[PDB]
Design a protein around this ligand. Structure first.
Ligand code: ONY
Length: 188
């Protein structure tokens, strides 16, 4: 077969019922997640190859970066609650991994302020039980797959992308192989 279990993807032995159709996990501490966002734009190219009848979900993980890792998962919840993912994703990556100016929750907050979210607005969201449940949603989804590594993408709670099984001599070719695989899996 052109697409094969163990090549472009693997099959979960305990599939997750009711999961999001297309679910990616990332960490702002994760070097490959940095590439996936700024250099490869994986999420955008996957969306361009799915129909407008499929929802895409992106969740942060706790297991990288200790205390600041958990702050960033809550900050991602704030970003999702306020709908400002596209405004804060790049400054958070660059602040953690490029300039290394994100060292505390206050520094994360500064990113949002500089991106234009009001201080009262950030703080009220940060402390809300709506954000508390968005944090719980991110944890529950990663725990359903005993997630131990990022970047990760899962399709219909049944299949996990296997980027190590694709060709990386060319960055655009890799991105389109990856996105075509998500499409094939979504249609499965
Ligand atoms: C099995 C399995 N374990 C995981 C997650 C583990 N974990 C920390 C990784 O790092 C895995 C990973 C992701 C992408 C990748 O391929 C790349 C990365 C960067 C660039 C760039 N620029 C290109 C072109 C391809 C290689 C490895 N997932 O599945």
């Amino acid at each position: 077969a052109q697409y094969e279990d163990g090549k472009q993807y693997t099959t979960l032995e305990k599939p997750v019922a009711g999961a999001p159709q297309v679910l990616e996990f990332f960490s702002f501490f994760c070097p490959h997640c940095y590439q996936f966002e700024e250099v490869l734009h994986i999420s955008d190219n996957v969306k361009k190859k799915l129909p407008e009848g499929v929802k895409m979900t992106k969740y942060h993980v706790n297991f990288m970066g200790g205390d600041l890792g958990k702050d960033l998962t809550q900050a991602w919840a704030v970003a999702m609650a306020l709908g400002v993912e596209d405004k804060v994703t790049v400054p958070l990556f660059e602040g953690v991994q490029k300039t290394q100016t994100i060292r505390s929750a206050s520094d994360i907050r500064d990113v949002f302020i500089n991106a234009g979210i009001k201080g009262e607005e950030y703080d009220a969201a940060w402390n809300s039980f709506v954000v508390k449940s968005l944090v719980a949603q991110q944890e529950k989804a990663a725990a359903d797959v005993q997630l131990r590594g990022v970047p990760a993408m899962f399709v219909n709670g049944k299949y996990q992308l296997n980027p190590q099984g694709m060709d990386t001599s060319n960055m655009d070719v890799f991105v389109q192989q990856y996105a075509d695989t998500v499409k094939y899996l979504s249609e499965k």
